[PDB]
Amino acid sequence: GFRKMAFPSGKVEGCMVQVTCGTTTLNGLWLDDVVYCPRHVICTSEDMLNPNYEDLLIRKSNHNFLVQAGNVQLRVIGHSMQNCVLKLKVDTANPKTPKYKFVRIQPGQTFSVLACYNGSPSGVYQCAMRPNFTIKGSFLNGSCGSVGFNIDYDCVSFCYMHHMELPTGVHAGTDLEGNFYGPFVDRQTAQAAGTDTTITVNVLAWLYAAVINGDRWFLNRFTTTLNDFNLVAMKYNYEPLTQDHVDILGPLSAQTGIAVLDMCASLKELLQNGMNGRTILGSALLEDEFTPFDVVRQCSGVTF
Amino acid sequence: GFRKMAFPSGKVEGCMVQVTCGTTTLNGLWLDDVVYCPRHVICTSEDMLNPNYEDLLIRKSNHNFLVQAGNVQLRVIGHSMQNCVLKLKVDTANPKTPKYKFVRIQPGQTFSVLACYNGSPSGVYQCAMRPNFTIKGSFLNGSCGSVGFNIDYDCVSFCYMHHMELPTGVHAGTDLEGNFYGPFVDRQTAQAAGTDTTITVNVLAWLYAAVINGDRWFLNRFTTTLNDFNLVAMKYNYEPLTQDHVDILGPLSAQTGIAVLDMCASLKELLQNGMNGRTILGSALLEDEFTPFDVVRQCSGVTF
Ligand SMILES: *[C@H](O)[C@H](C[C@@H]1CCNC1=O)NC(=O)[C@@H]1[C@@H]2[C@H](CN1C(=O)OCc1ccccc1)C2(C)C
Ligand SMILES: *[C@H](O)[C@H](C[C@@H]1CCNC1=O)NC(=O)[C@@H]1[C@@H]2[C@H](CN1C(=O)OCc1ccccc1)C2(C)C
Ligand code: NA
């Protein structure tokens, strides 16, 4: 009774366009009269090693940029660089432009990715921004410019644009102002993500989902303190739990009649003892990709 | 590098409407001038125990059916019953009607569900039709009339409409002609799904995905026969593997240079020996919700 659910993708689908510069094709985001795409579209293979993007952009003409919106070729009348994103001003506003915001998300928060190739949607899935500011996505060559988003009421909040894959096979990208999440740079060099930690508040959310869905074996009759729990958290590379985390879990706490520090005590035992070959919500591992809001949305059936 | 991916849901989002009959509200599918919804919308609580649907439908007037398409109230000018579905003919054709087909899917095949409440999309996720003709969905009260679908090229293939939850917490529903998948009836009585089996051909697909994504520990230097494998399959409640299954896996076989009967031998060892606390594509259990086509689509990046 509990699934990894993406937001409906319709409002974003109408914004996806193709952006080609020589042999290099990727996706763009067409909002009002502006197409946002990764700046590495202006790069040839050789200059991806240490590109001088300012110098490369100067060499570019509007006409070097082939922007298609399905069958339509869309006429670029201008180009500018904001951090690691290119803004291609176009002669036509997107008539399918939804109501939108650009937001910078926090590590631990979730969003939907609309994976595109050649400006066409392939698929939609839910992602978490890892504590080390990577995402564990499914992106191939051509996936760049694919976007991550949340929907609140009738408003699309864009939070991610895809730029690259790291050696570990995880993914990195920017906010829609072109500021990388984490320490990453848009050039083809070996780059280390931090050690990643498990998103403790999300694991608690998901244990609450497990209880709501009648799956309770792991509950014990013990409590604990933020202090003592955080000692075990540190030992298993779990993020420390703050009183903010405890306050955000209050609704799930109240719904289930299980105090947050009581759930923490249950999590302690799972980390120390493993799951003994048992499953929780049909998983053999502790899941950390569901925020407290994701759990509440899916158990209370919120719409858009 | 491998995720449970849903189809983009835009084309389906434009078809979802609200259908209310007394205190009973659920979702409808508005295609051309017809709204398709579960027939149990005409039911009061008491008559859900053993409804005479023919007699109940006779008592109904067009005006008993409140059909809203967002802010629009849509005027029902007719009602008919096809098996377990109600066709509410309306005065306006859906101007957002996509190109579509109604298809009856086979056990083992996957589809995207667009979970709706009050005619508004909440979320999208990928499902498999279990061998026992159930789905393991996330559906609350009000979710009925939510639809399952595939997209081929520019065509939406509707294959599922949601009707009910079984005692086990799994879900049952119909094709869009109102024929239940499996032995289920739309009345509030205890109903047994069969014993469910694991979709062997999908587990093989997913092991191929694991190899393509560099995750290979489980490969062994052994082969086997359909005959000998099916003896182990039967013992672990896996579906028997047919030469059709072997032919469908040919592309993944050819891509990886691993013969289907060689992968089967690897699966044999996993079933007999467990995973020794190892993970495959970040899972501690064998996944059976990915068809060979799903794997090929996601590793080759097919679009719509
Ligand atoms: C944009 O489509 C593309 C997406 C990558 C390619 C494979 N999976 C992805 O997520 N981004 C890039 O190609 C960037 C780009 C150059 C290299 N880079 C990158 O991801 O390097 C790793 C890579 C490349 C190709 C195949 C596998 C791995 C710069 C400018 C950062
Ligand atoms: C239609 O919205 C609704 C969806 C169920 C309710 C909870 N989760 C679901 O998938 N379908 C029904 O209510 C049908 C209907 C009557 C009963 N039934 C049903 O699912 O019974 C089980 C149930 C009901 C409510 C809450 C939990 C479980 C008939 C006519 C088959
Ligand atoms: Na131009």
Ligand code: NA
């Ligand atoms: Na009417």
